[PDB]
Amino acid sequence: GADAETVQNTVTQVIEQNMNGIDHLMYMSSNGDSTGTATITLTFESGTDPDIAQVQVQNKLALATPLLPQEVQQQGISVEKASSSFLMVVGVINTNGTMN
Amino acid sequence: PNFFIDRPIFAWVIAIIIMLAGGLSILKLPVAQYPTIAPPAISITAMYPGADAETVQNTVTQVIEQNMNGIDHLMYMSSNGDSTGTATITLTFESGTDPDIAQVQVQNKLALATPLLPQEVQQQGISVEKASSSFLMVVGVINTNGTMNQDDISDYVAANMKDPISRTSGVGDVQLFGSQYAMRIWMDPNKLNNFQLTPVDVISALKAQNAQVAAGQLGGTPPVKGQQLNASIIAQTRLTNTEEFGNILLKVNQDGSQVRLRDVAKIELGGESYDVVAKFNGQPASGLGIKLATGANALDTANAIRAELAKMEPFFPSGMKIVYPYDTTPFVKISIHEVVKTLVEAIILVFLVMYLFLQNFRATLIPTIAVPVVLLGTFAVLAAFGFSINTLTMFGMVLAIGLLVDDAIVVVENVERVMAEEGLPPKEATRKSMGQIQGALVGIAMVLSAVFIPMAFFGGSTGAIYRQFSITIVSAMALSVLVALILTPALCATMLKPIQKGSHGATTGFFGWFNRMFDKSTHHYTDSVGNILRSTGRYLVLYLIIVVGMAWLFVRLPSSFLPDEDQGVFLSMAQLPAGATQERTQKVLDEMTNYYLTKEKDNVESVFAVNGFGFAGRGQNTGIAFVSLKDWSQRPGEENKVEAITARAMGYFSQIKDAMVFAFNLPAIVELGTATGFDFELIDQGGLGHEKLTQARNQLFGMVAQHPDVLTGVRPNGLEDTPQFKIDIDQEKAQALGVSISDINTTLGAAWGGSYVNDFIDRGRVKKVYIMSEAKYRMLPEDIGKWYVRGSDGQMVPFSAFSTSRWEYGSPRLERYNGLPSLEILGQAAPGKSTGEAMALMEELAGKLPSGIGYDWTGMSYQERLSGNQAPALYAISLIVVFLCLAALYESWSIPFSVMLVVPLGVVGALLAATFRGLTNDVYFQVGLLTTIGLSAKNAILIVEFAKDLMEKEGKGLIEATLEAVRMRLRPILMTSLAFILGVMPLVISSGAGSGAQNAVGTGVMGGMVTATILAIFFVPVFFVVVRRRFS
Amino acid sequence: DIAQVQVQNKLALATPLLPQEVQQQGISVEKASSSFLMVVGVINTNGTMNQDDISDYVAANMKDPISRTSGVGDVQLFGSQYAMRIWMDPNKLNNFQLTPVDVISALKAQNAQVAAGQLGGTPPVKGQQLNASIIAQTRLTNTEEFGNIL
Amino acid sequence: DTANAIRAELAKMEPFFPSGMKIVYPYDTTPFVKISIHEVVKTLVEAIIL
Amino acid sequence: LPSGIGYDWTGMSYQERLSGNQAPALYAISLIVVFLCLAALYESWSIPFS
């Protein structure tokens, strides 16, 4: 229940301002939605170990988490390896039109 | 080498690829003063606002400590909690531990332990960081005008400078010396009592007013069929300025009059915390310290920081001014430049010495284009190993100078003298010379490898330092041997011209005079050795005397880790007694600042005094000054060096009765302590308590007062007990009235320690909202009765109605070690005694302590205990390998002893040089000692190899072959010795920036070179003759 | 190590959904083998201490340092640490019109470690000469203090 | 290595045990490992001798 | 565009720029390596130069 500007000021800016000093950080991008979702994407230099990068990102994020609003801490913060394309889209239809 | 004598261009392209790799590595090599030396440490910091030491320890520190299980490679953990409400748990890991993995494991364990912590502690947040107390630079912001105070400047820095600085490449942790803005609400107990309000009501209203509502959407799914508009709903309005917070409604009276927050409190934009106050030369200021990042050029990062600050300069309003009150980068640049100058001058002096002895321009050109190739390849292999350009690496390259120039001079001189004696053309002379010395060079490389590689396997921080030195010198020596077998023979074959107009035909002028005089000296020398070889028993007795003197000097010489340097900056600390307020400490710091800026106006350029902040710990008693001197050029003379300045300040600061103020120089490495010091923990192993542990510590101090001949300067590392104010709540009286314990505790805490209610958005930044009393109403114990709590019936009840007060003693700072209550004792060994015997005596005295009181060793004492007697074993293995390699080279089990007996010959000179100059037995001294041993061993190896070749190939007698050998090998020894001594001498006589390490490197190696050459040239023929006569 | 990091990262998203009692007990993510490396037992040869006393000693003095030893995946105490056990009586509770909720609230209120701030803390008035910590209320330490709770 | 570290830690703990309290070792699998390795090493030495 | 409005390439464009930027150095290094290898093999500077 936060607008995009509120998300930017409250969560994205804090997290991204703590995301400094990470090794082999190529570039960083962020966005804040009106749905109340903040996404920070750290892209590293090609050849960087993704596990060490994830560990370092978790290390920096833990410092920023207390500065975040309490509601977003209750929701939880996910640090995951990121891809921008689908490998596959497996779809499930129902013949006979039985189920919506 | 015969392969590359006929292929000069192959050798040239090999040298070209080596130099290109070296240049590429130099471009991409991190530059820092020192590498990662200390074992990795992880700091867990939590703040419990308003809590005392006991509250912090019993609600935070113990809970976190009990859950720090399952972490890998943990050596020890120590924790403390002080009256500021701060818990600091430091976990130290083994040297090889990956800091990222250790930190993530500690953070995961803490996160699993977080729900067990008080809500206030969780709200403040617990920070897990890699402990690194190394300020690369601190940049302060002052105001010429009086407009901006500490809080305003600090808020500006936080909101405009910290982010751009942290964006700069190669930056790390940043600590703002001020505090960001906050919405401070200063409650008045009288105004609250007038309207029958308590701090609880204020907290509730503040929490209610600031909120965020998930209001939803206008056309949210599932929508009605035919819907055409979708829009999000924004419901709750967050307060942004002080007027809105004042407008908050607290209560409505019967007549309709409204009790706003203005009526009961003063609302203003103040700082988050007022504990830390920083002033720069007496002016209000706020600064931010910078930590260096991994794999980053410290010089480049400093330049980037300065560029960013310069680009942000025009935006600063009014008299805002950027000031640098503390920086280490210029010292690093100066020291590295001095090392590079030493290398260049070493090359030039090699050129000059080779011309003086050979009088052949091309023969001088040959080594001048060989040593730089070795240095560049050393940079290449250094980068390949993952190392950086630092003080240890650079001074290791300086110590390696003798080896590289020795190899180049040996090859060139042997070729030249074969060309002169035999009259061979340059190519044939080169092939014959390489035939003579090619195997000996490989044997020398194998021997020298066995004497430096064992250094790399020492443990701990000292092991890391020795590993840096060992890898640098091993790489340089191996590459120089490789170059002497590939490039140098080809250069001798091609560049050198045939010797015409006779041999040494130059007879007129200084060079002719030198040739005549050196021929005489060589003849006198050979006669002397002949005389020496006539009766070798007396000279064996003399060598025994020399060895005994070596042992005596080695025993006498004091030991140390690293030299203290004049980095241009030093630190001053003030410690006020018992419960002294912030104002008194500020007065003391102002007196110190006035002394520095008036009595030390020539040397001191600026002093950055910060009140309430300390390296050891926080508190209103503590005080730190980042006093920075001028450039080394502006301060000539020993009286204007940091040591003299510190001595004069301590002379002045010893007469300050009110405080206990100290001034000291920066340690070389902070983690390393004094080599004579020990870190002793007095652990409470039996649940004795704080008082019994303190009594045990006092008894131990009484015992350490006896035996002053071993222990000196023992002292606690903590704080003695101070009076504390005890507010005791009577439960019966509290229940008799309508007052509730939660209300009482909330009122007391929110009044006297403050509460962090919630956040608000200020100019697009989230800032905290705090409530606390006005300072007027929380200064004295009488002010307790000014506060009232509402009963159930609606009647305000004074604190004096249900409570009593008393003054009792408590600990301002409690500490634990490995999960048990502890007291940290730190001291030093007596100057005559050593660290080991001091530690043994401390262990015995701790054993005399009462039952249930344990002990342990931490810090450098832990590593000393962990890795003891390792150096004798590693050097014994080194001796075994050297003997085996020499046996392989000489095809005999007895000849190697003639070479190996030259070690004391150089050790005596190193020890004498250190003793006469009043130096110590530090890391630089030991590495220079090893390089001296290597060079003397190489000289002895070449002499013995030449003698054996004369005896076998030429079929000459023992004495005849020995004499002819030393005659042949004299010129190279004198050439290399003169070049190395002349190159080293500026280090010995230097007195500028970084001259401590320069003197430590130079003096030992110079003395070792002088005595090693002088003694060896006469004792290695004796050793060879004695060995050959004794066996076969 | 990476497996544990990823597992705990996934767990952190589910922890706020768990009951408060489960979080209060504490969750443990461990990388340990199923089988026991060794069992270390403690025996009182005097015969005075019984299992509970021995177990408390082990929990309070041996369990944590062993757990922090490198390479120790998990430590199971074959017993339990001492705790302040309040054994309620329904008849006595009914006589005084008291429920376990009242006992819980009384324990929360009268067994608490209070942070009461400082006497003279920052910002101070101009001329302040004394700064002392305020001690308000500490957690109870023995059975008598708990029994004395009103 | 873990068993050796545990035994060292227990040795540190032992001088503070109250009176009759004693550490026993009812279950341990590392002694079998080390004794088996020693048996194989003795087998190798006997093989050299033979 | 007006002042204060910068730009940057990301995603595939970042990699495309990086490729174009590092292409000349690749050619230079490859040519130098080939020249040095030929000089080593043929023991001449004129042969590789031709």
Numbering used by the authors:
A (entry chain B): 51 to 150
B (entry chain A): 2 to 1033
C (entry chain C): 101 to 250
D (entry chain C): 301 to 350
E (entry chain B): 850 to 899
Paper text:
The K. pneumoniae AcrB (KpAcrB) multidrug efflux pump belongs to the resistance-nodulation-cell division (RND) superfamily of efflux transporters. This inner membrane efflux pump assembles with the KpAcrA periplasmic adaptor protein and the KpTolC outer membrane channel to form a tripartite efflux complex that spans the entire cell envelope to directly extrude drugs out of K. pneumoniae cells.
The three-dimensional reconstitution of KpAcrB led to a cryo-EM map at a nominal resolution of 2.82 Å, enabling us to build a model of this pump. Among these residues, we obtained very good quality cryo-EM densities from the first 1,033 residues. Interestingly, the cryo-EM structure of KpAcrB in the absence of drug indicates that this multidrug efflux pump forms an asymmetric trimer in which the three protomers possess distinct conformational states. Similar to structures of asymmetric EcAcrB, P. aeruginosa MexB, N. gonorrhoeae MtrD, and A. baumannii AdeJ, the conformations of the three apo-KpAcrB protomers can be assigned as “extrusion” (conformation of a protomer just after substrate export), “access” (presubstrate-binding form of a protomer with a vacant binding site), and “binding” (conformation of a protomer with a bound substrate) states, respectively (in a clockwise direction as shown Fig. 1B). No extra densities were observed within the periplasmic drug-binding sites of these three KpAcrB protomers, suggesting that our cryo-EM structure represents the apo form of KpAcrB (apo-KpAcrB). The entrance of the KpAcrB periplasmic cleft is surrounded with residues F663, F665, L667, R716, and L827. In KpAcrB, the composition of this distal hydrophobic patch is F178, V277, V611, and F614.
